[PDB]
């Protein structure tokens, strides 16, 4: 073997329904993943070529 161990993650990368998703959770039942990413895309500079 070229290696005896692989350096991997130690805990689960957490994601819970925080504040800005929770309004859409209660009013719609539509929670998205990374609401902050959508707000950084289509609000602050939607002209940004992804």
């Amino acid at each position: 073997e070229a290696d005896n161990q692989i350096m991997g993650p130690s805990s689960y990368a957490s994601f819970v329904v925080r504040g800005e998703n929770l309004v859409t959770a209660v009013s719609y039942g539509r929670v998205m993943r990374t609401f902050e990413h959508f707000m950084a895309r289509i609000v602050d500079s939607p002209e940004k070529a992804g």
């Binding site: 819970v16 329904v17 929770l22 959770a25 209660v26």
Partner: protein, 50 residues
């Protein structure tokens, strides 16, 4: 999300409790009106007997 569920449940229980004492207060006015109507002879008797 569980906190948002919890505050809604305590709002429901507080609404039911405040509803209970409010319905009891309206019942007090209803009982007062009923006991005053029970000791109430009509107009055409106490227009003369007085």
């Amino acid at each position: 999300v569980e906190y948002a569920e919890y505050v809604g449940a305590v709002k429901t229980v507080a609404s039911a409790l405040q509803f209970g004492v409010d319905a009891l207060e309206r019942g007090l006015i209803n009982t007062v009106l009923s006991v005053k109507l029970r000791h109430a002879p009509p107009m055409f008797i106490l227009q003369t007997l007085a």
